[PDB]
Symmetry: C4
Subunit: 132 residues, 4 copies
């Protein structure tokens, strides 16, 4: 036994590259800055993300929704090592969607078609941003 | 005499199945997680929902809107029994729509065409989610 | 000299009929529950609203916008008398738009094409709602 | 060394003309009231804005985004002088986007195509608004 802990907004540090959780429902999508990281996330060219990563979109209110995670050890290790923030990833986590995001989930009735983690570049001032 | 009490977000427990209040206006729709439940909600194949359930969408501010309910005894009984949360349904209730939802109501001028309660499944981690 | 006071959300009482401020920009519209009233608002069949009512949409932040009002005596008198709430209308008022509304104003750059006050009916439970 | 300070909502005073930060991503745009000013902002007919002004759109959470600025001295001087508020512009600033704005940035993945500062007029009551 165990519990789903919150991946807080603190794990996103501005000026660093970003890992974007991308989720398609079954029409309805949802882009969520996941984790600011030091290097890209290349996976083994063998394996797909869905082997180490399973996600559940549940409602938590009439207006609000959360996303729950199960992160198998390999990814948990890869991600802690990649993180700008001090080793923040646990096997069982969730994050909250804001009223705006929440409602997209709710309309598509929570039904995840696909999802993936994309590397998103930093911008012109990023160097200078994070050094401040 | 009596008063309309609030169906709070607490009645939605994540990991459990969900009853979705679906509302069409007269173009304009509105999906609202209503109540997390243990089993589905089958009604008598005879009766329609609208016999035990009447709803009113009124504004409560310049930006915000509420939905009011009258739940006839049969449904009030069926729902309390179905609820994951301890017996939360009263005959006269309302719930608040968030600024985002509110505005859809306001644009369609509150005019409800139709409405219904749909069963929405749980997702992959749901078992594990609610046991935490 | 004088100041623009806030028409608060309190002046909207649920269960009563509603006066909707409708605003078109120059594509971009904006519906705002204005004032809950006891009877409809018929104007003199002679005069248009714009004779007693002039409105200004200004920004108040990077994300937020307000609407300012000048209400000539006739309308100020008609409206206080119509109000469910105790005589709330002053000659110079404003109201705040929520982040959601605000942004529609901002995109259309605040440029009001037209505006009007429409009577909006009450719904099925309205009687019972306001008597609670 | 140095830090990016916040251009607060206070620098927008209602009743005064407005400078609108306009940003196109690479489909996705974003209009943000930047700074309320006393006169228009004409630049040298020679130079483009992008010579004194470079901007970076970074995420600060799972749901939220900021815009960072580098304002070269000429513009910093021109803007302080133009400002209604007491000399508020520093070389390195940022401003927060609200959940609504944030999400447009996030979807287009932060990738700024173009941006510019437009003069936006005041409205009918503006005179009277700011004198109150
Ligand atoms: N609640 C939830 N349902 C999901 C998820 N991924 C897929 N689904 C499917 O979505 C269904 C609920 O939405 P529905 O298809 O009934 O509108 C469930 O039966 C489930 O099979 C998820 O992450 N959360
Ligand atoms: N306010 C409100 N009006 C409703 C509702 N359901 C139907 N209506 C109808 O919507 C009308 C108000 O919107 P309108 O059609 O004038 O734009 C009322 O006259 C009423 O007949 C409801 O739940 N709330
Ligand atoms: N700021 C503001 N501008 C308005 C309003 N009504 C009309 N306008 C016009 O909108 C112009 C600003 O928007 P623009 O047309 O430059 O995008 C002003 O020059 C003004 O003539 C109002 O209520 N507020
Ligand atoms: N993060 C960020 N990226 C920007 C900005 N302006 C341009 N970009 C470009 O956007 C890319 C990230 O978005 P992508 O094109 O990978 O979806 C970066 O590689 C960068 O070259 C900005 O202001 N912020
Ligand atoms: N984060 C977001 C933003 C928009 N969307 C959807 O994708 C489409 C594009 O919406 P906008 O035109 O509002 O960007 C709409 O159908 C909207 O419902 C989404 O699914 N997830
Ligand atoms: N909860 C919601 C979400 C969207 N809608 C409406 O249905 C349509 C789909 O909107 P999106 O493209 O933003 O999903 C729009 O016309 C929007 O006004 C609604 O009526 N209730
Ligand atoms: N309160 C509102 C809601 C939507 N709108 C606009 O009218 C159109 C209908 O938007 P939805 O499809 O989101 O309802 C969009 O162009 C939107 O920008 C508006 O101008 N004022
Ligand atoms: N501030 C805003 C508002 C809308 N938009 C986008 O421009 C289009 C117009 O959206 P509405 O119809 O909601 O006004 C949509 O594709 C929306 O994603 C934007 O990019 N920045």
């Amino acid at each position: 036994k165990h519990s789903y802990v919150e991946l807080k907004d603190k794990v996103i540090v501005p000026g660093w590259p970003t890992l974007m959780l991308e989720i398609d429902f079954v029409n309805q999508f949802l882009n969520i800055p996941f984790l600011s990281v030091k290097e890209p996330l290349q996976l083994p060219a063998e394996k797909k993300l869905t082997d180490y990563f399973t996600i559940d979109v549940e409602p938590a209110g009439h207006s609000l929704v959360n996303i729950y995670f199960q992160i198998d050890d390999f990814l948990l290790l890869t991600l802690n090592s990649l993180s700008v923030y001090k080793d923040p990833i646990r096997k069982y986590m969730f994050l909250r969607l804001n009223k705006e995001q929440s409602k997209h989930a709710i309309n598509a009735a929570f039904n995840v078609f696909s999802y993936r983690l994309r590397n998103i570049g930093v911008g012109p001032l990023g160097p200078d941003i994070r050094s401040s």
